[PDB]
Design an enzyme around this catalytic site. Structure first.
Site, PDB file in Angstrom:
ATOM      1  N   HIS A  61       0.819  -0.818   0.095  1.00 32.64           N
ATOM      2  CA  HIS A  61       0.260   0.202   0.026  1.00 32.64           C
ATOM      3  C   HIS A  61       1.116   1.298  -0.124  1.00 32.64           C
ATOM      4  O   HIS A  61       0.642   2.241  -0.282  1.00 32.64           O
ATOM      5  CB  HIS A  61      -1.200  -0.401   1.311  1.00 32.64           C
ATOM      6  CG  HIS A  61      -0.392  -0.144   2.606  1.00 32.64           C
ATOM      7  ND1 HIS A  61      -0.424  -1.338   3.006  1.00 32.64           N
ATOM      8  CD2 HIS A  61       0.087   0.336   3.338  1.00 32.64           C
ATOM      9  CE1 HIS A  61       0.113  -1.320   4.588  1.00 32.64           C
ATOM     10  NE2 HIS A  61       0.382   0.248   4.659  1.00 32.64           N
ATOM     11  N   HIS A  91       6.512   6.498   5.930  1.00 35.20           N
ATOM     12  CA  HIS A  91       6.403   6.296   4.814  1.00 35.20           C
ATOM     13  C   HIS A  91       5.386   7.739   3.983  1.00 35.20           C
ATOM     14  O   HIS A  91       4.766   8.670   4.988  1.00 35.20           O
ATOM     15  CB  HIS A  91       4.552   5.743   4.760  1.00 35.20           C
ATOM     16  CG  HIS A  91       3.784   5.540   5.713  1.00 35.20           C
ATOM     17  ND1 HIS A  91       3.681   5.654   6.751  1.00 35.20           N
ATOM     18  CD2 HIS A  91       2.055   5.687   5.660  1.00 35.20           C
ATOM     19  CE1 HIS A  91       2.426   5.618   7.664  1.00 35.20           C
ATOM     20  NE2 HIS A  91       2.014   6.117   6.521  1.00 35.20           N
ATOM     21  N   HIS A  93       2.074   9.281   1.444  1.00 39.63           N
ATOM     22  CA  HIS A  93       0.194   9.131   0.887  1.00 39.63           C
ATOM     23  C   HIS A  93       1.110   9.663  -0.123  1.00 39.63           C
ATOM     24  O   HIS A  93       0.918  10.497   0.192  1.00 39.63           O
ATOM     25  CB  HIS A  93      -0.519   8.983   1.958  1.00 39.63           C
ATOM     26  CG  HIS A  93      -1.016   7.943   3.013  1.00 39.63           C
ATOM     27  ND1 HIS A  93      -1.137   7.343   2.980  1.00 39.63           N
ATOM     28  CD2 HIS A  93      -0.035   8.379   4.129  1.00 39.63           C
ATOM     29  CE1 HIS A  93      -1.184   6.717   4.420  1.00 39.63           C
ATOM     30  NE2 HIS A  93      -0.179   7.637   4.774  1.00 39.63           N
ATOM     31  N   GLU A 103      -3.709  12.997   3.496  1.00 39.89           N
ATOM     32  CA  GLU A 103      -5.117  12.535   4.014  1.00 39.89           C
ATOM     33  C   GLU A 103      -5.421  14.071   4.281  1.00 39.89           C
ATOM     34  O   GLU A 103      -6.371  13.976   4.243  1.00 39.89           O
ATOM     35  CB  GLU A 103      -4.111  11.382   4.894  1.00 39.89           C
ATOM     36  CG  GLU A 103      -4.123  10.328   3.872  1.00 39.89           C
ATOM     37  CD  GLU A 103      -4.060   8.906   4.501  1.00 39.89           C
ATOM     38  OE1 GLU A 103      -3.158   9.231   5.622  1.00 39.89           O
ATOM     39  OE2 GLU A 103      -3.920   8.520   4.006  1.00 39.89           O
ATOM     40  N   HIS A 116       4.804  10.418   7.137  1.00 44.26           N
ATOM     41  CA  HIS A 116       4.109  10.672   8.108  1.00 44.26           C
ATOM     42  C   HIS A 116       5.261   9.860   8.779  1.00 44.26           C
ATOM     43  O   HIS A 116       5.799   8.803   8.354  1.00 44.26           O
ATOM     44  CB  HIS A 116       2.915   9.481   8.224  1.00 44.26           C
ATOM     45  CG  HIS A 116       1.931  10.076   7.839  1.00 44.26           C
ATOM     46  ND1 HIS A 116       0.185   8.897   7.757  1.00 44.26           N
ATOM     47  CD2 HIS A 116       0.424  11.435   7.929  1.00 44.26           C
ATOM     48  CE1 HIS A 116      -0.459   9.931   7.342  1.00 44.26           C
ATOM     49  NE2 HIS A 116      -0.032  10.766   6.703  1.00 44.26           N
ATOM     50  N   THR A 195      -4.590   5.688   9.779  1.00 43.58           N
ATOM     51  CA  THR A 195      -5.565   6.166   8.356  1.00 43.58           C
ATOM     52  C   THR A 195      -6.107   4.796   7.732  1.00 43.58           C
ATOM     53  O   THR A 195      -6.248   5.057   6.317  1.00 43.58           O
ATOM     54  CB  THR A 195      -5.012   7.324   7.589  1.00 43.58           C
ATOM     55  OG1 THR A 195      -3.582   6.693   7.047  1.00 43.58           O
ATOM     56  CG2 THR A 195      -4.971   8.692   8.588  1.00 43.58           C
ATOM     57  N   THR A 196      -4.808   3.651   7.839  1.00 45.31           N
ATOM     58  CA  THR A 196      -5.143   2.938   7.151  1.00 45.31           C
ATOM     59  C   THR A 196      -5.575   1.609   7.965  1.00 45.31           C
ATOM     60  O   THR A 196      -5.340   1.647   8.552  1.00 45.31           O
ATOM     61  CB  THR A 196      -3.429   1.928   6.783  1.00 45.31           C
ATOM     62  OG1 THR A 196      -2.905   1.988   7.380  1.00 45.31           O
ATOM     63  CG2 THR A 196      -3.818   3.533   5.590  1.00 45.31           C
TER      64      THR A 196
HETATM   65  C1  LIG Z   1       1.410  -1.640  11.858  1.00 43.84           C
HETATM   66  C2  LIG Z   1       1.177  -0.339  11.084  1.00 43.84           C
HETATM   67  C3  LIG Z   1      -0.619  -0.827  10.877  1.00 43.84           C
HETATM   68  C4  LIG Z   1      -0.745   0.971   9.238  1.00 43.84           C
HETATM   69  N1  LIG Z   1      -0.063   0.407   8.464  1.00 43.84           N
HETATM   70  C5  LIG Z   1      -0.465   1.690   9.928  1.00 43.84           C
HETATM   71  C6  LIG Z   1      -0.725   2.602   9.351  1.00 43.84           C
HETATM   72  C7  LIG Z   1      -0.237   4.183   9.997  1.00 43.84           C
HETATM   73  S1  LIG Z   1      -0.623   5.981   9.896  1.00 43.84           S
HETATM   74  N2  LIG Z   1      -1.229   6.134   7.770  1.00 43.84           N
HETATM   75  O1  LIG Z   1      -1.331   6.311  10.272  1.00 43.84           O
HETATM   76  O2  LIG Z   1       0.328   6.753   9.227  1.00 43.84           O
HETATM   77  S2  LIG Z   1       1.422   4.009  11.029  1.00 43.84           S
HETATM   78  C8  LIG Z   1       0.698   2.210  10.828  1.00 43.84           C
HETATM   79  S3  LIG Z   1       1.468   0.934  12.051  1.00 43.84           S
HETATM   80  O3  LIG Z   1       0.943   0.975  13.421  1.00 43.84           O
HETATM   81  O4  LIG Z   1       2.678   1.764  11.634  1.00 43.84           O
HETATM   82 ZN   LIG Z   2       0.669   7.491   6.573  1.00 44.17          ZN
END
Ligand SMILES: C[C@H]1C[C@H](N)c2cc(S(N)(=O)=O)sc2S1(=O)=O
Ligand SMILES: [Zn+2]
Ligand code: MMC
Length: 256
Positions: A61, A91, A93, A103, A116, A195-196
């Site tokens: 993703h 990471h 988006h 986002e 993020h 947010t995922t």
């Molecule tokens: C284990 C991972 C589970 C999710 N894929 C996620 C999304 C993140 S965000 N977009 O809110 O910054 S941080 C994160 S995590 O908890 O590291």
């Molecule tokens: Zn994120």
């Protein structure tokens, strides 16, 4: 499984993760005229000089840059936070076009991407325990807009051919996160969630006021990645972002 297409995208996530309809979901639109200036909010303290990056990985993703978090090497404290939050990964988006991708939005304006930097509260001992707590994580969100090249982002941009498809990784050591920070550490902050999936409501969002800028050709390379694993129909990794969710009685505080 979840993704961002028509059939498995954000609007479908509630069926498998019922908390998608909950109370402190993220992202949200930041209405700057209703965010409350809170003079008791301390300045952010980002100590990233000891950071140890280890890996970059395409996870289907987005791509994550992972950090060694076995000791307080890159930490975040101050601001709205009680105690030390350790950096584990970052990471982005991003969108298929420069006017979408972020986002969080600011007065409904969307940016080209959002970074993020994910941190967990060290009093819970490990990341796994921190996602069982309401104040377990702090994510530092930085907006990206297209303009001048950001030098400090080029080392990431260059390794992306090495992790084009889902599951690939490459060693990615001695990357210094400080090269991705804007000049100002002024921020908005509110209680939110990941947010995922799994969309756990454990996050203190700290969103920085000032965008960093990146060049158009730096953003173009993000769009050449693939959601798909190797040897499947090519599916460009674009638009991996969640639409803004209802604020639902939370207040956004501003440090400025
Ligand atoms: C284990 C991972 C589970 C999710 N894929 C996620 C999304 C993140 S965000 N977009 O809110 O910054 S941080 C994160 S995590 O908890 O590291
Ligand atoms: Zn994120
Ligand atoms: C409760 Hg996270």
């Amino acid at each position: 499984h979840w993704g961002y297409g028509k059939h498995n995208g954000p609007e479908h996530w509630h069926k498998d993760f019922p908390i998608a309809k909950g109370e402190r979901q993220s992202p949200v639109d930041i209405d700057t005229h209703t965010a409350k200036y809170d003079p008791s909010l301390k300045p952010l303290s980002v100590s990233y000089d000891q950071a140890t990056s280890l890996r970059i990985l395409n996870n289907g993703h987005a791509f994550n840059v992972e950090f060694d978090d076995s000791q307080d090497k890159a930490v975040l404290k101050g601001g709205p936070l009680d105690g030390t939050y350790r950096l584990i990964q970052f990471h982005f988006h991003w969108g298929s076009l420069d006017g979408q991708g972020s986002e969080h939005t600011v007065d409904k304006k969307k940016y080209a991407a959002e970074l993020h930097l994910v941190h967990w509260n060290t009093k819970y001992g490990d990341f796994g325990k921190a996602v069982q707590q309401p104040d377990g994580l702090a994510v530092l969100g930085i907006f990206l807009k297209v303009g001048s090249a950001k030098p400090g982002l080029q080392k990431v941009v260059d390794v992306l051919d090495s992790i084009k498809t889902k599951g690939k990784s490459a060693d990615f050591t001695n990357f210094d996160p400080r090269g991705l920070l804007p000049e100002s550490l002024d921020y908005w902050t509110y209680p939110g969630s990941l947010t995922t999936p799994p969309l756990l409501e454990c996050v203190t969002w700290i969103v920085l006021k000032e965008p960093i800028s990146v060049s158009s050709e730096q953003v173009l390379k993000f769009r050449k990645l693939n959601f798909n694993g190797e040897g499947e129909p090519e599916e460009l990794m674009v638009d991996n972002w969640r639409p803004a969710q209802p604020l639902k009685n939370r207040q956004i505080k501003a440090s400025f």
